[model samples]
Target: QNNTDYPFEANNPYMYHENPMEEGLSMLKLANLAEAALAFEAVCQKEPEREEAWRSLGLTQAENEKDGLAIIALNHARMLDPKDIAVHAALAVSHTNEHNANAALASLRAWLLSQPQYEQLGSVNLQAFFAAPNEYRECRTLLHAALEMNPNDAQLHASLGVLYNLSNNYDSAAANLRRAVELRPDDAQLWNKLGATLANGNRPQEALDAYNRALDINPGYVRVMYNMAVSYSNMSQYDLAAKQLVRAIYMQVGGTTPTGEASREATRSMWDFFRMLLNVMNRPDLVELTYAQNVEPFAKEFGLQSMLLENLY
Candidate 1:
């Protein structure tokens, strides 16, 4: 088997008669973003003049969370087609992800300019809108400026809420998050954030109510269950804490490993937390019962039987 000389065949489908662009789009449809990137890369190499190839490459890299890589391809796409709305919009997102604030703002302006509907606002109005954009270097400040531009935007309020939470400004976080949930009641993620914010503010009852709304919309939210368990523990309700932890365990374990074995790092943290909760409750017997009744059976159901073989110790 002296296969070293052959190495590997050409991975770029464009080298053959196959259409790499179609191959790239097919990979995107399958949610295989890395493969999509490779296919798009092939197309770009085969045809550097193609705006779509570069745009697809950038968009795929963005979806794959490789925003630094996305920026270069997106820049090329923008140059090739200056009037493209999606290119500038996606470039804006990638630039923001990479913390290139000025580039992000520029991309946003370009995106706005490319949109026909925004023509009514006029370039003078758009310029005024982005005037003194230096303040946007701070994400929190940028969020505030964005809100000033459109006070009723739910996502802007939500973004501000997350920033306030990170800075330990729990009261402000709760206020903004409350507004976000009020504006977008159907958004389960926003509801979860509101709950977590209230919980951080030491208002367990309010937090529990927010978590309830979140779970009402999305019952499979493992993180919300974890947060709810924390709220119950904070309220000195050991029974409720145990119940929430049990539910979270089942959901997290089942959700993490649907197609194969569970991730050790993911399940191990939850299991350790569960054990700590059990110890605090002085209910060691329930540990074995929980494993027997909740974890083990669900592991089998989710094709994560390998987890059963791992010693918790």
Candidate 2:
């Protein structure tokens, strides 16, 4: 109960060895982790089987820079509650801080396996998770280690793939992107990056292959339909370009652009792409000289127009 052998395998509205576990939770809620650690420590002794006790203990130790014990305690929590996402995410980060990328990747992979619902989104978000230039160094360091350890690790491949894609390294971008998708087929805007990168590589056919996956995994994403049109345009497939672009304009929606066109900022950001696509597709009539409120309906209709577009995309 007190020790661990970490291969490093790595929520709370929310811990502890108490009512003191509640005390631990109260401290955690207030952002007072040091005192919470003490509370969790006691709970660990008094309620060793309690998953929160061990998990909070692990996380509190993490705040304390007791990385070694954090891994152990988190793993204990994982043993108790295999489906706990918070415990696994923290464990992965703790391992990452130590440059334990292999362990971190394993910890992260285990977490993803536990949430099949996130199988598609998890890798994509992690790319965003480490999207900052300062943050990319962290992804790369772990990536190199993960690659050295297992040249064929998907988390490693995906991290490298996303990083390369972001940095505009076309060759490595397509290379890594292809590998990650090959290992785990999934999508959204995530697939468009591969298609765009392949287009950059002059691999029009391969670009279409990924554009196919994006449309396949998440159909009728109006913005991706835009990318689809462009990918086809790049290949001189003008009719396909015209159809998808027209579809994007009305069937509407997709891309980094939000569906409702709600923000001046959001719509402002997309003008050139939408504007140009309209021009090239011979629909310059739809290209507005100025954006207006009437365009809100522009994205609302769908094949069925039946479902809600919630806050999450």
Candidate 3:
């Protein structure tokens, strides 16, 4: 069996095919985004007729921060397969990333019209809304309607739990999330969400337990790893916090980059920039000082006097 005798040399085929596109999709799922983009690009070249390949290429590119290329690939995907709900959704996300809010909204609206039944998948839709701040109210309304239509939907309850968590309605969030976990005990993501909501409600120990359960189900879930890290941070366990953050970074789920070392460095730079802005704007105390003298003077120098005046007046 000489490998050279095989008709397929990696570079020989110039058209997108189902096999290569499927492989590309797998890479995307695993968060190997740059490799996924290259694979999908290869598929597009080999088989221009495969609209899905272009759409996937666009999604991978978008995840990798190649917004312009993403838009172009997604546009071609839409032209070829106008009715594809996933393609429309991806297009909406790409547009939103490019700050074309109007275009994003239009694309999302089109997708919603075409896949009205997706409202039944409340958890998925709610996550989508959470990712897009501007779409929250609309998605909430849709979720409410879906809940009315199917009152016994456990996932819907879980979705509402997360929504309530976001809105700071701790009691309802905990209740719904608990019920969802009871209904689907094996669901790692749901358990992670429950733990996060519980932590938000100030139940740190219980939240830790729930997070542990989530990790038991899916150790690779980076979001759960982050949640656990937050719990450790709240408990003043700095070493554990660093460990969990490292784990999340390794999983690529909560990391700074979706692909490539350069992108990773760029992500770190952006994070560093924002962190500096936060420190400057908040004026966090860096050293111990007398409350009535040094601390008060420093605070006063930075608009603290006005803040106190506004509060007292």
Candidate 4:
């Protein structure tokens, strides 16, 4: 029905099986978060006592944007290893994602309390510090101090990046996220974060490059496709943006109505964006299709019929 050459092909064909833990880590290395999540889930079930399995599962789920499930799995991991810095950090991020500020601070506190210096300062009352009106500055000051102490810490950089992002400091957030990406080169989510920050900073071309790198690491990363589409739209590449939005919707909904609770919630994000993009593209016909959850015809109209096969069966 239509024809236009976009920069990317909507294809994700990677799958296999092996020792669950090894498979999970290997899939993670390749940024196949869904398969990694399944492998780690298998480990969690087969070895309930395995703290590593729970931690891995929680991290994978968090990356998959299942913050509620991530919180549960991470809590189990924390019960097994109360002082795990990684679990505490991941928990804080997941809680923050859910907008549970109190819970996020608790996890962040847990993270800080694990450090002997912070405990010794008797200022573990950082919670009270945040209670002050200028708490945002306090948080940034502490993060910078921690960065000075552990300059190479990717997690610390990511925390600062997220903090900056929350405060609308997109330019600074992009700088911190770039540092995080350097420290953790294989982190697909960090690349996504960087791309988003760049786009928000009005550097859409750079943002598109970052998004491309993220997809290179994780071909099935639906979120990055959405981010890439937004950048394309910002740059007035509407057709390219439409193509990606169509692909992202297909990935999230699987060419059908979302049935599971989580699936429904996840698909909503894609549909919301698709509707807005369709409006921008002036395609009221396709925008109306989104109401009935009939996006396949829109995909066909966009010449993205091939995207229907991208699902991980």
My TM-score estimates for the predictions, one after another, are 0.52, 0.43, 0.48, 0.68
Q: So what's the TM-score on candidate 4? A: 0.68
Tens-place lDDT per residue, model 3, 249-284, is 435423323444544542353233323433534534
Whole-model lDDT, model 4: 0.74
Clashing residue pairs in candidate 2, if any?
10-107, 16-43, 16-53, 17-43, 17-44, 18-21, 222-253, 223-253, 223-254
Predicted candidate 2 versus true structure: per-residue lDDT over 45-67, tens digit per residue: 66678887788788888765678
Query: Among these predicted structures, which one has the highest TM-score?
Result: 4
- Candidate 1 Cα errors over 4 Å, as ranges: 1-141, 254-260, 263-265, 287-313
Instruction: List per-prediction Cα lDDT, in the order shown.
Output: 0.67, 0.61, 0.61, 0.74
Clashing residue pairs in candidate 1 are none
What are the per-residue Cα lDDT tens digits for candidate 1 across 120-224?
333332221243344333444445655676788676676566455544678998999999988989999788878988988999999999999998887766678
Task: Tell me how many clashing residue pairs each candidate has.
Answer: 0, 9, 7, 0
**Cα lDDT for residue 145, model 3?**
72
The reply for model 3, stretches above 4 Å from the true place, is: 1-20, 26-34, 41-51, 54-142, 152-155, 158-180, 183-186, 195-206, 246-313
Query: Residue-wise lDDT of candidate 4 within 19-87, one digit each (tens)?
Result: 678988887866567667777777766678889988888888898888877888888888888888888
lDDT (C-alpha) at residue 97 in model 1: 52
What pairs collide in candidate 3?
14-45, 14-46, 15-46, 15-47, 16-43, 16-46, 16-47
Candidate that would win on lDDT: 4
